[PDB]
Amino acid sequence: NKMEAKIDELINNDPVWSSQNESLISKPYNHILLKPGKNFRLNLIVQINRVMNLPKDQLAIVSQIVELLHNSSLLIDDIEDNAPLRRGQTTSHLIFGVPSTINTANYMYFRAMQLVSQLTTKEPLYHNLITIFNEELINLHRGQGLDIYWRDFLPEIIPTQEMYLNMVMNKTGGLFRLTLRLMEALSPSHGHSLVPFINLLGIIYQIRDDYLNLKDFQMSFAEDITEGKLSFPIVHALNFTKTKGQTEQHNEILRILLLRTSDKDIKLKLIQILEFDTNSLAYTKNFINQLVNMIKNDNENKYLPELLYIIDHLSEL
């Protein structure tokens, strides 16, 4: 009778959720907020609004959405890559546990989704916005999915340079495109689609990330090696040795990646294979320079609409 009352009261109302609960579930996410870089992301949005000109109000929601997805994908990525550190501080899963961190990351994907219906009340443009959201999140997952698959099934498949570019288009292009596409759809104005340029951007960004992880270490943790990642320099190297018939160095690269080693001496050995044998770091520094020139020597603004500036500090988005 009193129990039935309380039950009937419970089931006739919306599920209870307090802000103390919100705070609990938010701890793993809030922890990654301490990580810097929010400005270089924001700067890229700002700079881009000069072409799209979204009403400051609207630009902020787009910004919050982007932040949520970006930070959430990183929380997940660190669990998937078993990373002990991010932007120098301890990763969330190591503090709040893998359980809570996955759940919080996933919760924020859907919170981000909710922020979408607040960009416009126009029913047709709403659909477009959700579709854009849906599609790019699907691409991000396909790309991350292949990145993980090749790493975890090695040495079953060894990606070619081209397979890798297709992976990055999905993986790193997803959020770049998502941000750009939302803005172009909300633009009250602006010229050619700036997507090809945001694509080139994502690509440059990922190779440089793959590059600097090995270079910073050479000149002085190179986690990518410990992770066993088919990064750009590695794909080059594996394909070079197979092509040049260098069986030993090929297998030697495979063996080090498969060790999932934290050993600095072994780490160096692979980098030395990469400098002296396949010259892959040099090859990669070059490849990036050319992608960058495709935007620098863009006189007929085929890709272009300050961008030179972002492109150089791109490593901190």
Ligand X SMILES: CC(C)=CCC/C(C)=C/COP(=O)(O)OP(=O)(O)O
Q: How far is the CB of 165 from Mg ion (least distance, A)?
A: 16
Q: How far is the CB of 32 from Mg ion (least distance, A)?
A: 13
CA 135, CA 129: separation in Å to the nearest integer?
Answer: 10
Tell me: does residue 76 bind ligand X (CB under 6 A). yes
Tell me: does residue 175 bind a second copy (CB under 8 A). no
CA 152, CA 101: separation in Å to the nearest integer?
Answer: 22
What is the number of the residue whose Cβ is closest to ligand X? 144
CB burial of 163-193 (b: ≥16 within 10 Å; e: otherwise) equals: ebeebbbbbbbbbbbbbbbbbbebeeeeeee
CA 270, CA 213: separation in Å to the nearest integer?
Answer: 13
CA 205, CA 36: separation in Å to the nearest integer?
Answer: 17
User: Which among 38-46, 73-81, 126-134, 196-204 is the span making contact with ligand X, rule CB under 6 A?
Assistant: 73-81
Q: How far is the CB of 125 from ligand X (least distance, A)?
A: 26
Among 59, 71, 81, 169, binds ligand X (CB under 6 A): 81
Of the pair 37, 55, the CB lying nearest ligand X is at 37
Of the pair 205, 249, the CB lying nearest a second copy is at 205
Among 58, 63, 71, 73, binds ligand X (CB under 6 A): 73
Residues in the interface with ligand X (CB under 6 A) total: 11
Q: How far is the CB of 282 from ligand X (least distance, A)?
A: 21
Tell me: does residue 81 bind Mg ion (CB under 5 A). yes
216, two tokens: 């910073």
CB burial of 7-25 (b: ≥16 within 10 Å; e: otherwise) equals: eeeeeeeeeeeeeeeeeee
231, two tokens: 């990064």
Q: State the binding partner of 138 from Mg ion, ligand X, a second copy, none, CB within 5 to 8 A by kind.
A: a second copy
